[PDB]
Structure 1
């Protein structure tokens, strides 16, 4: 199955989510893949008062086949199932009748974290920010720790609901107001065929540099494989949006080195204690890797200490 613990087809879909598609006015595309897209839209009547609201709508393109159509439905059943959580992109509604299925979520105004990190890289301040220059919205080490904590909190939640992400990366984390991170999954709304972070492994285009050895060599995805990905996310975060294993292509030598125990060194801005988390996430033995709840407790202490 394309889901390890839960079966989304057996999961129900509450019609409390059902939203009239005529009440959706579409805007610009926030992201698009071969078979799907995420578009910005204005939803009318989503609030008790006549007030309009900005939402993000995931949908398929006419290029999509039955397997993608089924994927979008199962994705909807899972989002319905998870419900409200601060560190997860929240579902607002859906359109199942009247045409193609539309998945309506909240709009995260700052977009994906990867691009945010990249545009903030050159103005990053490791130490404390001056009171005068606070308006400039400088990225600090405090924000990075807050983001690493929130993503673990979100992942801990997902894990308690027996959900495996299978693509935990900075590109699949959105940033909203108040420096709040929200785990998402662009999936079909990402052009993986042209994204250099995805690699041809057999007949698939997989994010190999974020995958645990067991996921690469056995296509087994567990709670422990998501912890590995998180460790790579931590590297991207404290590297301020750098691509993992810089200068190393995904070749025979790459696979051999990961199997043999090669692991990235600490990014330039990673506190020593955060690198310790990354090293444990990358343990060759999945049973020796921390759980997301362990990670939460670890980061929580690091935060209090500062």
Structure 2
């Protein structure tokens, strides 16, 4: 809907009083918005005088209409999706009489790419965390958690469309959380989502159906999840290394696929390759990936 004339309706069950929100240090500053740490007094009903640390998503000064539209759309997607352990959960919003603030769970260890890169096995980096180096089991656990979140997402008939390590957050207790639902869509009762001619989805994570046929389904999210797996098992590597997106289009049509990451078993690399099957229906579902991943994690854990 046209944001320049749209009045955000009252939504008492999510509304949060501005006087109870204290903005703190910035957490992130993308192109389309900004996220800051805040203290939210009484946001959890169970401790009404207690302030809880939250993250607040808001517009920047030079925001566009599409920026506002995306922030609204993200807020509305998080309402319909509901709660899961592996999803950044919506906590509240300040929508009336002032700038739109979308209040979500705080993930104190930040985005997944930097989280993995800081936990790599021995450039000079002041951000490394030697005591938390990733084991193979940690990487599989990471993957399983994200597969559980996408399984819950798919079961809500929601496509995320922008799956990638940069859109995963890690909490204080090392819980993986899918974030950034600004491009997410509800596909209940439609079979597939119809893409515009040139989309706003990063090309190196897009399924071929979406790139070339303009269609997006859950199986398209499964393709992105495969690229995400590759990011995880290279410990925050960036995909199709050395291949500019302008050459990738043709390479994908010729069946080009990324090579096996150094830290990956053949088993897991085959799982990535299955996610990148040319035929969407021949990729595993998130339900199957959860089953496979649980089986592998159970073996590794023992």
Asked which structure has the greater RCO (Cα within 8 Å, sep 6+), the reply is: 1
Cα deviation code 1:82-129 (max 9, x no counterpart): 121100001111111121221101101101111101111135xxxxxx
Residue 57 of structure 2: SS of its match in structure 1?
strand
> Is residue 77 from structure 1 mapped to residue 76 from structure 2 by the alignment?
yes
Q: Contact 2:36–2:57 at 8 Å: present in 1 too?
A: yes
Work out the CA distance in 2 between the residues paired with 1:86 and 1:186.
16
Written as runs of structure 1 = structure 2, the 5 A alignment for 1:236-275 is: 236-251=231-246, 253-275=247-269
Work out the CA distance in 2 between the residues paired with 1:266 and 1:113.
20
RMSD in angstroms over aligned alpha carbons? 2.4
TM normalised by structure 2 equals 0.84
Unaligned runs of 5+ in 1: 2-8, 124-134, 189-200
Q: Which residue of 2 aligns with 1:24?
A: 21
* 1:13–1:218 distance in 2 versus 1, CA, 3 Å: farther
Written as runs of structure 1 = structure 2, the 5 A alignment for 1:93-112 is: 93-112=92-111
Cα deviation code 1:242-291 (max 9, x no counterpart): 1111111222x321111111111110111221111101100011111110
Residue 96 of structure 2: SS of its match in structure 1?
coil
> Is residue 122 from structure 1 mapped to residue 117 from structure 2 by the alignment?
no
State the Cα distance separating 1:186 from its structure 2 match: 7.0
* 1:247–1:53 distance in 2 versus 1, CA, 3 Å: same
The partner residue of 2:31 within 30, 34, 45 is 34
State the Cα distance separating 1:203 from its structure 2 match: 6.0
State the Cα distance separating 1:43 from its structure 2 match: 1.2
* 1:21–1:76 distance in 2 versus 1, CA, 3 Å: same
Count of residues in Structure 1 that have an aligned counterpart in Structure 2 = 274
Q: Contact 2:108–2:172 at 8 Å: present in 1 too?
A: yes
* 1:74–1:122 distance in 2 versus 1, CA, 3 Å: same
TM normalised by structure 1 equals 0.83
Work out the CA distance in 2 between the residues paired with 1:290 and 1:14.
38
Work out the CA distance in 2 between the residues paired with 1:91 and 1:78.
9
Q: Which residue of 1 aligns with 2:190?
A: none
Work out the CA distance in 2 between the residues paired with 1:244 and 1:289.
19
